[PDB]
Amino acid sequence: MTFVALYDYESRTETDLSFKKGERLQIVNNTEGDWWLAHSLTTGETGYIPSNYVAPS
Amino acid sequence: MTFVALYDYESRTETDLSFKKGERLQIVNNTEGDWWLAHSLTTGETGYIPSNYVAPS
């Protein structure tokens, strides 16, 4: 439900949240799912993906 | 381990991976953890956060 930031984090893109240690955060439900860092065996490209867009082999 | 893309996805930032339905993807281990959409109760701002930076209340 509710979480506390353990460290400062500075945003690197337009979509991430900057926060300071000690902030209280609540998880937002959304249709994309959690995001995972992934490597495409098909294209060789690498980056974050929305987990609801994929399924186990 | 290995996953298959169920849908096309077009990148929206410099860090996400674009992929087509059918691509084979493998999860990359990294120090940040999975990313979650979160709302800061402290600042009112909202965006994605690295899960390894937070802990349950």
Author numbering:
A (entry chain A), B (entry chain A): 84 to 140
What's the paper's own text on this?
The non-receptor c-Src tyrosine kinase participates in different signaling processes by phosphorylation of tyrosine residues in a variety of proteins, modifying their properties, such as enzymatic activity, subcellular localization and stability. The c-Src tyrosine kinase is made up of six functional regions: (i) a N-terminal fatty acid-acylation domain, (ii) a unique domain, (iii) a Src homology 3 (SH3) domain, (iv) a Src homology 2 (SH2) domain, (v) a catalytic domain, and (vi) a C-terminal regulatory domain. Of all those, the SH3 domain plays a key role in the regulation of the tyrosine kinase activity through the recognition of an intramolecular Proline Rich Motif (PRM) and, additionally, through the interaction with other PRMs present in other proteins. To better understand the mechanism of 3D-domain swapping formation in c-Src-SH3 domain, and its plausible implication in amyloid fibril formation, we have solved the crystallographic structures of the WT and three mutants at position 128 of the c-Src-SH3 domain.
